[PDB]
Scaffold this active site. Structure first.
Site, PDB file in Angstrom:
ATOM      1  N   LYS A 235      84.970   8.444 -31.106  1.00 12.19           N
ATOM      2  CA  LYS A 235      86.172   8.876 -31.062  1.00 12.19           C
ATOM      3  C   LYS A 235      85.963   9.452 -32.689  1.00 12.19           C
ATOM      4  CE  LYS A 235      90.683   9.394 -32.075  1.00 12.19           C
ATOM      5  NZ  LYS A 235      91.406   9.065 -32.650  1.00 12.19           N
ATOM      6  N   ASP A 254      90.311   9.757 -26.442  1.00 15.64           N
ATOM      7  CA  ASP A 254      91.094   8.165 -27.286  1.00 15.64           C
ATOM      8  C   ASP A 254      92.091   8.219 -25.560  1.00 15.64           C
ATOM      9  OD1 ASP A 254      92.505  10.483 -27.906  1.00 15.64           O
ATOM     10  OD2 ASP A 254      93.823   9.098 -29.184  1.00 15.64           O
TER      11      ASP A 254
HETATM   12  C1  LIG Z   1      97.080   9.898 -36.391  1.00 10.92           C
HETATM   13  C2  LIG Z   1      96.231   8.364 -35.740  1.00 10.92           C
HETATM   14  C3  LIG Z   1      97.231   7.332 -35.156  1.00 10.92           C
HETATM   15  C4  LIG Z   1      94.879   8.521 -35.294  1.00 10.92           C
HETATM   16  C5  LIG Z   1      96.109   9.099 -34.338  1.00 10.92           C
HETATM   17  C6  LIG Z   1      95.465   8.843 -32.755  1.00 10.92           C
HETATM   18  N1  LIG Z   1      95.749  10.504 -34.344  1.00 10.92           N
HETATM   19  C7  LIG Z   1      94.293  11.521 -34.328  1.00 10.92           C
HETATM   20  O1  LIG Z   1      93.204  10.723 -33.709  1.00 10.92           O
HETATM   21  C8  LIG Z   1      94.103  13.303 -33.879  1.00 10.92           C
HETATM   22  C9  LIG Z   1      93.008  13.786 -32.974  1.00 10.92           C
HETATM   23  C10 LIG Z   1      93.322  15.060 -33.068  1.00 10.92           C
HETATM   24  C11 LIG Z   1      91.985  16.171 -32.727  1.00 10.92           C
HETATM   25  C12 LIG Z   1      92.977  17.882 -32.718  1.00 10.92           C
HETATM   26  C13 LIG Z   1      93.806  17.425 -33.553  1.00 10.92           C
HETATM   27  N2  LIG Z   1      93.491  16.015 -33.729  1.00 10.92           N
HETATM   28  C14 LIG Z   1      95.223  15.136 -34.344  1.00 10.92           C
HETATM   29  N3  LIG Z   1      95.243  13.847 -34.708  1.00 10.92           N
END
Ligand SMILES: CC1(C)C[C@]1(C)NC(=O)c1cc2cccn2cn1
Ligand code: NI
Length: 305
Positions: A235, A254
């Site tokens: 991921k 996820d």
């Molecule tokens: C911030 C956080 C708790 C780590 C999490 C779960 N966010 C992301 O993985 C994610 C993926 C993504 C794919 C395209 C735009 N995105 C924006 N944020």
């Protein structure tokens, strides 16, 4: 002299503009929605943060993107970096039109949430940020990255009561007593994977140039190369591919993507979350939306949250 965070009306000579519509880019949906953890809205509609050993402050109108840099106005070379950073060459209106035509859910959902696009982050900065994003929210990760740059990274400038630092190099992260120092900040189990990944990229491979080579390489080769590193799972590798290594087809999968796919698209694995099912779900969205799959995922993330 004591330096303050700049607004557009206060010190207007120091601001330079870029012709950018609000529908192409909204700063309030991009700069603090899990992509980059370095931007903070200090004053209303004014996001301040670091970009490669230099602090910026960003704001916008309906048709303009006003920016300023701290040291006079930004140069033509410095305006070129923000054009690459936001990736304004990629027309967002054509993609929203493409996604809306081939997806009924996106057509209804993406009306309110315009101007959601992927940033073009530094591969080193992007990599070590998501290594310490293990089951932690945005506020927790933003705290870790701030304390990480404060201790290890070089001091740049102070504005109000906020000391800005650049991102740590590979030499600082791969130190002698680094794991003890990183654990003191509150990393936990992730502190060991920062020291191990820093040693791998710097000593064995080469340095920051190795990650720059992955930007030119294909998606499958880039994702497989990231997964060999210690701490980087499947991921986190897709996040780095999408956000740093220029892979718009990459889709980080996820538990929240499972929720959207199941509820809004009626999706199931052909067999809960697993390596085979997550790989299948990434291909499902690539087949639906097309080459800019991860960009469409960012729109749904903004609309859901
Ligand atoms: C911030 C956080 C708790 C780590 C999490 C779960 N966010 C992301 O993985 C994610 C993926 C993504 C794919 C395209 C735009 N995105 C924006 N944020
Ligand atoms: Ni079901």
């Amino acid at each position: 002299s004591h330096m303050r965070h700049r607004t557009l009306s206060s010190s207007p000579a120091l601001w330079a503009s870029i012709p950018c519509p609000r529908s192409e880019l909204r700063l309030d949906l991009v700069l603090a929605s899990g992509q980059s953890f370095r931007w903070k809205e200090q004053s209303p509609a004014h996001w301040s943060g670091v970009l490669a050993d230099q602090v910026w402050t960003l704001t916008q109108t309906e048709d303009q993107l006003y920016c300023t840099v701290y040291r006079s106005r930004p140069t033509l070379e410095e305006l070129e970096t923000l054009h690459k950073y936001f990736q304004l060459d990629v027309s967002l209106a054509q993609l929203y039109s493409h996604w809306a035509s081939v997806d009924s859910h996106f057509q209804r959902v993406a009306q309110k949430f315009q101007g959601v696009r992927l940033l073009r982050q530094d591969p080193t900065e992007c990599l070590f940020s998501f290594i310490c994003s293990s089951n932690n929210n945005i506020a927790r990760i933003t705290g870790m990255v701030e304390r990480l740059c404060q201790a290890f990274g070089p001091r740049l400038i102070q504005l109000d009561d906020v000391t800005y630092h650049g991102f740590p190099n590979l030499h600082a992260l791969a130190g002698p007593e680094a794991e003890t120092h990183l654990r003191k900040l509150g990393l936990g189990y992730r502190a060991r994977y920062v020291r191990a990944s820093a040693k791998a990229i710097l000593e064995e491979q080469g340095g920051p140039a190795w990650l720059q080579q992955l930007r030119v390489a294909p998606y499958e080769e880039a994702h497989k190369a990231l997964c060999t590193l210690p701490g980087v799972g499947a991921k986190v590798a897709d996040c780095i591919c999408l956000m740093a290594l220029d892979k718009p087809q990459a889709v980080p999968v996820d538990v929240h993507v499972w929720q959207i796919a199941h509820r809004d698209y009626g999706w199931h694995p052909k067999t809960g979350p697993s390596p085979l099912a997550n790989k299948e779900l990434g291909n499902f969205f690539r087949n639906l939306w097309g080459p800019y799959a991860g960009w469409a995922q960012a729109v749904l993330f903004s609309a859901d949250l």
